[PDB]
């Protein structure tokens, strides 16, 4: 199976209430493993997954050191952007940064990314060739020039294709039981009379991992996309995920509907029918 | 692990 490691950084200014809030979290596929919170008491990078706890003090001291360097950078960033767009110093603003690498089934480098956003809009992003940038704004072009002159892209490329992939592999290895496992969804259907001539059919998919899944309804084998209530895949809170799809059925027509479930952990795609 | 690069805007 394919895998990825991704880091998320959020920086939020608080005019008059002290320093900006800085939060960082790390993920491997859909499992979070570390975090840093500027408002927290420890002031350190912390474990959020059992398999990373076995890393020694050098790991934590190092990660703690670099993560707080990140924090300061985004603290300068907030001021710079304010200037770039001539904004008042009283308004709260947001900066987000995300980066990581994707690896194929052979655990080989597939793709790398490094994106940045100001107040929720794309600002600048490294293109897939890891040699060029996408600047949306005039402000973003100014940043692109700084980054080209400082050869940021080249440093990023070494990181994304080298150490990023390398530590992902190590993590996949060290956390095999949790990161390399595939929990197929436990599925089932519910039927509920909505009125005298209509009924709701809900198809459930529970405790599956990873989160990726395709849940669908058909009437006489034809897709019912527009007449299906499909909720967003959600965390169960124990490392697994859940999701459901529902359609309102005219009483007496239950048999012509089929629910289709596709997931990495299912040997064959499932086809369910109320009957 | 986290990247050591971090270019200022």
């Amino acid at each position: 199976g394919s895998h990825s490691m991704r880091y998320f950084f959020t920086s939020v200014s608080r005019p008059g209430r002290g320093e900006p809030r800085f939060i960082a979290v790390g993920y491997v596929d859909d499992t979070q493993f570390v975090r840093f919170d500027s408002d927290a008491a420890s002031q350190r990078m912390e474990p959020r997954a059992p398999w990373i706890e076995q890393e020694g003090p050098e790991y934590w001291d190092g990660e703690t050191r670099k993560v707080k360097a990140h924090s300061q950078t985004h603290r300068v960033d907030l001021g710079t952007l304010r200037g770039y767009y001539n904004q008042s110093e009283a308004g709260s603003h947001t900066v987000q940064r995300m980066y990581g690498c994707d690896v194929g089934s052979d655990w080989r480098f597939l793709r790398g990314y490094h994106q940045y956003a100001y107040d929720g809009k794309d600002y600048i992003a490294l293109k897939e060739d890891l040699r060029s940038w996408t600047a949306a704004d005039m402000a973003a072009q100014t940043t692109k020039h700084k980054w080209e002159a400082a050869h940021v892209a080249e440093q990023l490329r070494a990181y994304l294709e080298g150490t990023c992939v390398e530590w992902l592999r190590r993590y996949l290895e060290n956390g095999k039981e949790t990161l390399q496992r595939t929990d197929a969804p436990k599925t089932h259907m519910t039927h509920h009379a909505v009125s005298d001539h209509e009924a709701t059919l809900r198809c459930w998919a529970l405790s599956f991992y990873p989160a990726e899944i395709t849940l669908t309804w058909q009437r006489d084998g034809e897709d019912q996309t527009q007449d299906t209530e499909l909720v967003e895949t959600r965390p169960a809170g124990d490392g697994t995920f859940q999701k459901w799809a529902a359609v309102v059925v005219p009483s007496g027509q239950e048999q012509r509907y089929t629910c289709h479930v596709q997931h990495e952990g299912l040997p064959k795609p499932l086809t369910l029918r109320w009957e | 692990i986290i990247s050591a690069v971090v270019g200022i805007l």
């Binding site: 998320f8 959020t10 939020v12 939060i23 979290v25 993920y27 979070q32 975090r35 919170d37 959020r48 709260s92 603003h93 947001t94 987000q96 995300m98 956003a117 107040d119 929720g120 809009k121 794309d122 519910t190 509920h192 809900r202 529970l206 909720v231 967003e232 959600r234 965390p235 169960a236 809170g237 124990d238 859940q242 459901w244 | -």
Partner: protein
């Protein structure tokens, strides 16, 4: 600036069985900016022991958080999630339905 309204889902970690301990969840996503108040309620009352996941976001930069608390469902107890954010005129309340 950009302001996206949060999607809300109230549900239990495991299928609800009266008398058995479980976890009640409230998942908020697709919102921006990140300040958001989220509370879980038991018969209209704010539950005090509520934890939440660390702040993170999707590819489109929108935020998502999971608030959750231990609980033992019952036939008569009513639960709900109440959320407030700059995109809502008033607190949005959505009730817990064990079949959803």
């Amino acid at each position: 600036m950009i302001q996206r309204t949060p999607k809300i889902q109230v549900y239990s970690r495991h299928p609800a069985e009266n008398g058995k301990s479980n976890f009640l969840n409230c998942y908020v996503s697709g919102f921006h900016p990140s300040d958001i108040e989220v509370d879980l309620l038991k018969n209209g009352e704010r539950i005090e022991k509520v934890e939440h996941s660390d702040l993170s976001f999707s590819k489109d930069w929108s935020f998502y958080l999971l608030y959750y608390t231990e609980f033992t469902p019952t036939e008569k107890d009513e639960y709900a999630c109440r959320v407030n954010h700059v995109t809502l005129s008033q607190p949005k309340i959505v009730k817990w339905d064990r079949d959803m």
